[PDB]
Amino acid sequence: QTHIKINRGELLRGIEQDHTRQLPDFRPGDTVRVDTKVREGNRTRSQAFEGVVIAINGSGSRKSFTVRKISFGEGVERVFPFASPLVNQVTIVERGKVRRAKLYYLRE
Amino acid sequence: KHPVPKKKTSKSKRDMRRSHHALTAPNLTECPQCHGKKLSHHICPNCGYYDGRQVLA
Amino acid sequence: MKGILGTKIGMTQIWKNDRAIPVTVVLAGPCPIVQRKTAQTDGYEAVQIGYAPKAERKVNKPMQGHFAKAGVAPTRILREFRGFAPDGDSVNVDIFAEGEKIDATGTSKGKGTQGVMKRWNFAGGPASHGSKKWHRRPGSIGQRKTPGRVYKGKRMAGHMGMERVTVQNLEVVEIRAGENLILVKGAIPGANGGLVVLRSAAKAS
Amino acid sequence: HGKAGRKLNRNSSARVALARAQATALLREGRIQTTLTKAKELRPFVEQLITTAKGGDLHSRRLVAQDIHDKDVVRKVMDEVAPKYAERPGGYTRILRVGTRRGDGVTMALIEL
Amino acid sequence: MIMPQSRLDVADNSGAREIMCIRVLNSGIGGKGLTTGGGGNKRYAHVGDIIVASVKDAAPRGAVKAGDVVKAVVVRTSHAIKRADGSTIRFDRNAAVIINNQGEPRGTRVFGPVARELRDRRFMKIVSLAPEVL
RNA sequence: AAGGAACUUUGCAAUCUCACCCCGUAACUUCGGAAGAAGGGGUCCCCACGCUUCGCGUGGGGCGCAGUGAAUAGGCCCAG
RNA sequence: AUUCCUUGUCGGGUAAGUUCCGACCUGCACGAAAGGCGUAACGAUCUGGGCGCUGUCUCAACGAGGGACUCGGUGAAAUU
RNA sequence: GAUGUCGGCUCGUCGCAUCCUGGGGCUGAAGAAGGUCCCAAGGGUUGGGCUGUUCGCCCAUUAAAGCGGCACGCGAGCUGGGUUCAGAACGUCGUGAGACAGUUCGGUCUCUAUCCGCUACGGGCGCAGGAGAAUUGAGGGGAGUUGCUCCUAGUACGAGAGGACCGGAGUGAACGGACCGCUGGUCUCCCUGCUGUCGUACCAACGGCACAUGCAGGGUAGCUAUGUCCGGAACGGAUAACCGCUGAAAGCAUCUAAGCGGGAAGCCAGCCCCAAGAUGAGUUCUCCCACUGAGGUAAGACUCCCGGAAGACCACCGGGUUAAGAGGCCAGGCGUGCACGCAUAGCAAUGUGUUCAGCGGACUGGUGCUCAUCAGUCGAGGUCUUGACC
Ligand SMILES: CO[C@H]1C[C@@H](C)O[C@@H](O[C@@H]2[C@@H](C)[C@H](O[C@H]3C[C@@](C)(OC)[C@H](OC(C)=O)[C@H](C)O3)[C@@H](C)C(=O)O[C@H]([C@H](C)[C@@H](C)O)[C@H](C)[C@H](OC(C)=O)[C@@H](C)C(=O)[C@@](C)(O)C[C@@H]2C)[C@@H]1C
Ligand SMILES: [K+]
Ligand SMILES: [K+]
Ligand SMILES: [K+]
Ligand SMILES: [K+]
Ligand SMILES: [K+]
Ligand SMILES: [Mg+2]
Ligand SMILES: [Mg+2]
Ligand SMILES: [Mg+2]
Ligand SMILES: [Mg+2]
Ligand SMILES: [Mg+2]
Ligand SMILES: [Mg+2]
Ligand SMILES: [Mg+2]
Ligand SMILES: [Mg+2]
Ligand SMILES: [Mg+2]
Ligand SMILES: [Mg+2]
Ligand SMILES: [Mg+2]
Ligand SMILES: [Mg+2]
Ligand SMILES: [Mg+2]
Ligand SMILES: [Mg+2]
Ligand SMILES: [Mg+2]
Ligand SMILES: [Mg+2]
Ligand SMILES: [Mg+2]
Ligand SMILES: [Mg+2]
Ligand SMILES: [Mg+2]
Ligand SMILES: [Mg+2]
Ligand SMILES: [Mg+2]
Ligand SMILES: [Mg+2]
Ligand SMILES: [Mg+2]
Ligand SMILES: [Mg+2]
Ligand SMILES: [Mg+2]
Ligand SMILES: [Mg+2]
Ligand SMILES: [Mg+2]
Ligand SMILES: [Mg+2]
Ligand SMILES: [Mg+2]
Ligand SMILES: [Mg+2]
Ligand SMILES: [Mg+2]
Ligand SMILES: [Mg+2]
Ligand SMILES: [Mg+2]
Ligand SMILES: [Mg+2]
Ligand SMILES: [Mg+2]
Ligand SMILES: [Mg+2]
Ligand SMILES: [Mg+2]
Ligand SMILES: [Mg+2]
Ligand SMILES: [Mg+2]
Ligand code: NA
Ligand code: NA
Ligand code: NA
């Protein structure tokens, strides 16, 4: 409707690089994310999720990954914003040999 | 047939309807090459030019 | 009262403190004042304001004349406001603060000729029980021999979309003075590159 | 809405056998006349095809052969046409609209190199 | 989400194995016991939401038998739940914990990881019996 | 997506099932049948050895999410 | 499938059953070749329940194709 | 010479003898919970088992699960379960053919809207000059629900147990509007994998058909609720039941005759949207102007072209070579997930390296390589009267 001369891509980047965070080169194989859990009033907990990355969705602020863990005989997927402030560090446990970027078959 | 009309329509009405059926006259141009009238943004069907000559006469 | 015009640029992620706030980026380019509507000289109080800049080669002689009266520069868009009457021009700085709630209005995307299920929610009919009126197709339209007629201003297929829409109470998360940018928690109507008008909180909590 | 990105006239295999058949045709004949729409649709496909073939690598050729199932033509575009179109940014294809037709009343046009 | 007619797994030793939903309530726990529902609609039971339900298949020898109308709280949905940081959680199966009008668990312990909106919803004792809180 | 007959006069409709080999198979019965009950497993490619020929068996190895890899292809049960 | 009173009374199944199953009895108006009662097998038959599965539903979305819409050509009908 | 029957589904709207919220009087009203009456239709009034059911009973909830009207609203909107077609059967009356206070299984619900009415959208003309744009608002629509918890306060009250009005804060449900950043869906050829067969001579690599994608896996833009954002209100004016002040006729009493105040989810206004055809056709800024004997022209617009988060066609927006509009091309993002070829390892199927490979729709920019060339059509010289002003 308005037709200004302006690159909006770069505009968005500018307001999004301040909320972008770069992580270890994982793609396949396992990971341990050490996350803070401070929503318990005052006490600040720390829990670790360790599983098999199966998602590299997004970029910039919106970038994230999905990891899958079996905890107490029960399937569990988590989804983490690379840039979530309730995430400390992330570590690769081991690398894995796969032929596609999803792995939504590990569910059965 | 459910889609039947009640009364026959009047000449008057039946013509008022048609008051939107008049074809537009093709706005024609003068060809700067073979002085023939042609269709804008097209090729002069006569001499065959369009900035220099493209089609076969 | 106060307000300005800008372009919807897009929505993105943005944590504030410890929480993920969805935001919608808006370009509140500097807005010139082109005409001061004095109630005395007109009939009501108001201010005309311009947005996207245009090439003088594209601007009508008359419109040039308009722009000459204040002498700023030919712009492609003009709109008015209320009670707003400052000096200089209209930059979102000093105008909007981070934390202030704002009414953000614009033209929605339009969906064209949408049925009733889309348009008015409706409900259409059974898809299995043996029909010819599946998906949409409304039921009846009235009663019977009594007002053998359907009510003025009722629910039927039409042009969905293309409407002026004003969403109330949106939070000003962040403001980049100089980059003439503003972030607004949540979604604003219309498409990216759409015109949006950001007005002061009218009747708020 | 409907803010997508391509044209369709028939099904899915169709728009393909089309774009291919016509691309081949034009490449072979250097100019063809067709419906202004079909022309418009062909322009970018074929432009892009020159750019592929415009590589020389056997790969580029084997790519081009997926569309152009005619050998003489693949060789033409590959070794003759592409080469020639080496210095010009991109795409040398143009469209000239002739005029209305009699059979169905459809405006025709010429696409050529 | 959760909605009536919808079979669940039981995350406790209350005796019950699988239970079908009878109606979704509006988890009015707080103050003294459980309170009356914030309405008569609510069509989907989220996590940390109290529902009513019937026992469908239960184990021989247990506190709760087949055919029993009882309230339980939802601990694990396959629907995804979004946390305020921006993250997301979801469990391969849907389960609940049978309770009493005081909101306490009928079992002696909980089986499997429970959500965590449960803590928010002040279900302290459940979180107590719980192996993990994801 | 989540749920799974809540739809409705009625699971109407449309799914699931689906070939061929192997294992296994209730009540009842006119002992023929119920039965293809139900249920479970296998299924491709290469190499070697063996045998009755188009193959098949055994062992080892390889690839994919998946191997009657596409088409042709029973849903089952209880009771009246 | 004879049922009126009646959704009869009890039990079974269901969270909840007017129908369904099993009994009882006051069989309006069952009954032994207009055959009585029962019966394996059979059934595009009729009824009830269950498992699996599903857009049948909560509740709709997206995608495709053939029409609907536009241009050129041909050009009806019931009705009045 | 036809007013189609029950119930459901769909879609509504209206009455008030008001089911719930709102405001009151009275009480055998301590409080809390109720009872009854008066005022009040703004909004709301859940999901299921059985039955063709409308009813009704039951499960589980809810503030509440209101009663009626509209041809017991609605079949040129749907269904066809029920009921008055033809078949068959039971009980049953009749000697019979047949019949019904019966019950039971089965049994074709008609592609095209003329007019009015309704939703969307254009063309003409008008609005005393011809034009570009910004607008006031007469009027008109939408919206209108409500629980729970906390604070006040465990105070008032009450023997106790129990346990407030008022006011002030939080969080839900359902509903609606927008939006696509997230979570997901889809994405009919964007990438990959797989099978049978046919072809490009064969090998290798590919294409086609197996759907109107062969099948499978995944998926950008767009579109989309199950996702998210926001909303219902505060204030104010005039009122209803009702509650009061000053105060006569009854030189007492009295809300009342004069006069005035307070007071409901209702009314009006406030909030969102439309709105000058409001033919009483409104206001403001700016532009071209005082030709010619209907026509050249100015301002300005149209046609035509190229496109578009605009769209049935029209219409609306942008661009049209003093050009960055689209395509292409370049770079980048994103999706797929390691290309062909060659080399190496193995008897082979394969594996490994080259190879963060190759391929590529919609995304974000840049660039004059392509097409928007050229040119035509339309479009003012502004009636009269009265009054005022120099
Ligand atoms: C008062 O208004 C009624 C009166 C009633 C006696 O009759 C109706 O109209 C009848 C008609 C609509 C039929 O309705 C059926 C079904 C039913 C359920 O009602 C909906 C009833 O059935 C019951 C209750 O059992 C009904 C008895 O009979 C219809 C389905 C057809 O059969 O359509 C058929 C087909 C589409 C055709 C096009 O093939 C043709 C149209 C039709 O037939 C023929 C043979 O063409 C036409 C030529 C014709 O003969 C007709 C003119 O007389 C119309 C019929 C008489 C009238 C509206
Ligand atoms: K995704
Ligand atoms: K379907
Ligand atoms: K035609
Ligand atoms: K007899
Ligand atoms: K008004
Ligand atoms: Mg009718
Ligand atoms: Mg009338
Ligand atoms: Mg095909
Ligand atoms: Mg699923
Ligand atoms: Mg299942
Ligand atoms: Mg029902
Ligand atoms: Mg069926
Ligand atoms: Mg098939
Ligand atoms: Mg089949
Ligand atoms: Mg009975
Ligand atoms: Mg019982
Ligand atoms: Mg006899
Ligand atoms: Mg037979
Ligand atoms: Mg049932
Ligand atoms: Mg539907
Ligand atoms: Mg669609
Ligand atoms: Mg008649
Ligand atoms: Mg008639
Ligand atoms: Mg009243
Ligand atoms: Mg009281
Ligand atoms: Mg039933
Ligand atoms: Mg009546
Ligand atoms: Mg009726
Ligand atoms: Mg019937
Ligand atoms: Mg008969
Ligand atoms: Mg039949
Ligand atoms: Mg008409
Ligand atoms: Mg109003
Ligand atoms: Mg909506
Ligand atoms: Mg995106
Ligand atoms: Mg060959
Ligand atoms: Mg080969
Ligand atoms: Mg072929
Ligand atoms: Mg063939
Ligand atoms: Mg075919
Ligand atoms: Mg697919
Ligand atoms: Mg919503
Ligand atoms: Mg291609
Ligand atoms: Mg571009
Ligand atoms: Na196509
Ligand atoms: Na019973
Ligand atoms: Na009402």
Ligand code: NA
């Ligand atoms: Na009910």
Ligand code: NA
């Ligand atoms: Na009603």
Ligand code: NA
């Ligand atoms: Na019809």
Ligand code: NA
């Ligand atoms: Na037709």
Ligand code: NA
């Ligand atoms: Na209060």
